[PDB]
């Protein structure tokens, strides 16, 4: 909102509009965590932590009464700078449809870079646990490309022994989504049979996440909560350069470690 | 007076 | 009902709801032989036996007298009893999401795993009769996965040629179902061909089952009667634990035999 | 009707319904010919013949009169006896669900048998000459399951050759469908392709038909007409057995004998 | 008084 | 006071 | 009309239900230059040459005078002579359904042949040029069948070089046709990815064509004007034979010569 | 409008009509650069330039004044002159439907090559840049057909690591399409992978473009300005001669020329 | 008076 | 007066 310092920016509306829309389709494209775990969505600038509802005990505490600490996780704000031409946003103005904003294009990368690696393999300075880093289940080894139809259902098998019902998402990252979308086995394409044997969505392709993933799409196992939402905020500027953030407000926990199951690359 | 994104899926 | 005597459980209503929950999305996905066989609803606590119809000759009786005796199959009443923390259950009136339950995941399935090992296997000491153990038909030997149609089509000839008519549905057991639906054929999923043989919903899989099985979905082969349905109830509690029950009270009947061919493992 | 003395039987209404719905399964799901041929309504009991239009010479006659006389078809009935037990059919009124009834079975099978061998390869004896035997086309080697579509093709080029139009069946028998139907040419079913090459219905397997058959569907080739429908009628009873039959009165005519090709079992 | 056959297609 | 389970399919 | 003197003939209304209906299932069915080439609908008996606007120099014209004749090109009146038995078709009066009328299919597919090899070949003594004969371009060699989609796409190539755009249809005469329909490449049916090829109706089997045809489907290319359509007329009977015939009067003009191309058996 | 100066050519309004039609379904059939690209609507005759937005500094200028003069694109006016028989435009009054028009369809094909050519290819006699010869990234190497599915995943992964969202359209040259559309790899037709790989739509052959090419489709970064769109105009004529021209004025704008990834041929 | 044949397609 | 074009896709 107004921690966004917007209205104090050398901007003209559109140009305002051309970083916003520019921020928005990275965002829209790229993120990958907040398709796979539940939202609880926006609560502002001022929403702190998130209450685990557990109690700690307290140590050297008397015998007349019982002491216990609340236990909650805060939230990470992140911030990612980014800088523009003052002379390339006032083209706009002059009726320029392509703005330099390659900075923009970097910054919102990096943002989703972040929340995707937080959600998938942790983020400790954060305290922040992810998917893959909290599973207990071993690791499936994916020898080769034709071997991912197997592997997903041993994983199935593996997440119905724990308890973990559900409807099961299989999340790639990009070099088996790529190898993936790529095999033949003798001509029939293997991501036919997979995507027969899994939810019926398009199978998520997630740039953070090294090898592969099956997890539970019942719900209640992985929650991501959001503060402030991603939002292009202004900082400072000279004569030439004005410098603007992403920011965002958020924290990560899973609720249910044994939910997913990790795949070694194919 | 954020992007607007919230939940994606 | 009141024989469950939850209100005397020292467990809030968001716990009792929470254990609910995850007992129930547990029997939702796991009971396989209730997707298979007629049933004959809910009759309460009181409901002790099925009438069969039939009638017995009696012994040692005289000439100007016949007497004949009624048969029934009694219900077997089944509990798993399983225990949790009540700290635990308190975490979720101060709001934890994720309380410690997985005791009634693990007596969840152990229920289930009864029940269906009674209606695929039989349960002897409650005077179950299973459906594989009580057909006369020869068990098919499936080589390989690659044998999976042509032993479909055998089974359904075979039920064809003792009056057995109806739609035909496979159940696999989890290693059957696993190798079927990895199983490629020069490329080609050996499990398209083979839904294209059966009845066109999804395959079964019966964790409680021994390889494969074919049967009549024609309705009126086999019937599972259910007194008191699947429910938690609660038996006892300390100042930490609390002890609770999955009850139910059930009996199986296989009022056709002939209705369905075992394959032997794939 | 009254023919079927059914109220003379020692027979409960539900008992009635239990024999008339075991036989009435069987029918709707063995009857082949019926799914393929023309049918002319059940007229009753007292439909004699069909009236063919025909007429022919009479031979010894004077010079001064032309004499000719009038061609019919007359119609067989057909009685298939069997025997039920009656504490098995008094066991319906005390509840029973599965009364022994696989005599209605067989009898009914019998009676399937009957009229599909009489429709497909004739019944001499009935005066009726069947599709297979009746045809002038010479009939088709099947050297393999894999020669299925060129045969199909080449036997639709006979039928267009003589004039033959419509689209066209192919009707298997038992061994021919089980082998199509489990049939892979490099992977690939060798039943899609076939059913691509005919009309989009499920393939007719017919139990009576040796080989395989492939015939026009335009109408007016092959008709079947039925005078009394299946039925099941009342015989006679003592103490403990009571005799029942299966009846039905038809012939089968074929219009058009070109109008199907044989082919040699694959 | 029949089963109700009839045709079949 | 039962789950509702029920009948599956 | 009254030129088919059929109130003359002795025939009752329903055996001249049966000779219509006849014929016109063999035409409905195999008549297939009607299915691709443009229809100008049918004149009736005065109809007698199409105007193709055109004009010739005329020779030997004086220097104050220029003359020049229109073009036309003149209708063919076509008739097919059969002969059916008298007695016969009284038969359909006394409630035959199958009078003896293989010569009316005779007569109706000698109709089709005419019709259709003068589209396809060409009618040099009625002044016709067919599709293949006047098409500019090379005659594409298909060596076999699997070579056919090459040669689709090809022939494509060459319409599309000489400016002929549209959708484009492949013609199969029957070799090529029974031949693309019963191929497989390594199990795949090539009829399969032929017909993702081209438009997307049933391919056209043509029993008059030799070899195959691609050609544009856009309208204007080819031109089959009817005057008097396909009928049947009376022409003489004595006491036991009537002689009827298959009427037609048409011809077809080929306006753009470039928009097929004649494809070499496979 | 009135520069086309249409009625003072010696053309009936029918054979307007007709040459109009010819260049339509030409226009229609092959403009590929129109079904990939912005298309900024057309502007008419007076429009001039298309307005960049951008500024440029002019050199030599004081120091108490800063001075920058405005950057635009100038649009080309393409004539493409053909001729046409007066005595063939007279035909189509007299009731011709084939007048001889080819050089309609000459002067349509060589508009529309020269259009594309533009857009794919650049035409730097008219300042214009073109998709292939302005995009930074490194053109990939497609060795054979069955590697066309691997290139365009890559294809894809390089545009999402530039910043370039937005779903991707694969455009093939005339060699590419036709290869891509008859291969199979182990009889599975290669084609059928890549359309699921890229954007659902039939893929666009551009018969103007080497190789082929993988391109966003989310819009703004390729736009092609029209002035006066593509029209048939009267230029002069003689007793015999009748001489027309294809009139088009328009410019492309490469915005984002990251935006496309070249594929060498396959 | 014909069998009304006319266009196929 | 144009052929009326336009965008095609």
Do not use: C
């Not at chain 1, 509009?17 to 790229?30: L, N, P, R, V, W």
């Not at chain 1, 305290?127 to 490309?145: C, F, N, R, W």
């Not at chain 1, 991501?191 to 044997?197: D, E, N, S, T």
């Not at chain 1, 392709?205 to 292009?232: C, F, H, K, P």
Request: hydrophobic letters at 45%.
């Amino acid at each position: 909102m107004d921690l966004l310092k917007r209205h104090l920016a050398p901007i003209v509306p559109d140009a305002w509009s051309a970083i916003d829309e520019e921020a928005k389709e990275i965002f829209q494209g790229h993120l990958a965590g907040r398709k796979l775990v539940d939202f609880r969505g926006p609560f502002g600038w001022e929403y702190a932590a998130v209450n685990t509802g557990e109690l700690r005990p307290i140590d050297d505490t008397p015998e007349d009464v019982d002491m216990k600490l609340r236990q909650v996780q805060p939230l990470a704000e992140v911030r990612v700078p980014f800088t523009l031409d003052v002379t390339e946003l006032d083209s706009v103005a002059r009726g320029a449809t392509n703005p330099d904003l390659d900075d923009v294009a970097r910054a919102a990368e990096r943002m989703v870079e972040a929340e995707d690696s937080a959600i998938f393999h942790g983020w400790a300075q954060a305290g922040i646990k992810g998917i893959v880093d909290s599973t207990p289940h071993e690791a499936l080894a994916v020898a080769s490309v034709s071997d991912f139809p197997r592997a997903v259902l041993s994983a199935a098998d593996t997440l119905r022994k724990a308890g973990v019902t559900g409807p099961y998402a299989l999340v790639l990252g990009p070099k088996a989504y790529d190898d993936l979308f790529a095999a033949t086995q003798d001509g029939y394409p293997v991501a036919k049979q997979v995507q027969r044997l899994v939810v019926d969505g398009p199978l998520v392709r997630a740039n953070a996440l090294a090898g592969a993933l099956v997890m539970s799409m019942r719900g209640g196992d992985y929650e991501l909560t959001v503060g402030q939402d991603l939002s292009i905020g202004y900082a400072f500027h000279d004569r030439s350069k004005v410098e603007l953030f992403v920011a965002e407000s958020f924290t990560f926990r899973v609720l249910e470690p044994g939910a997913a199951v990790h795949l070694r690359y194919a | 007076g954020s992007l607007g994104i919230g939940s994606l899926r």
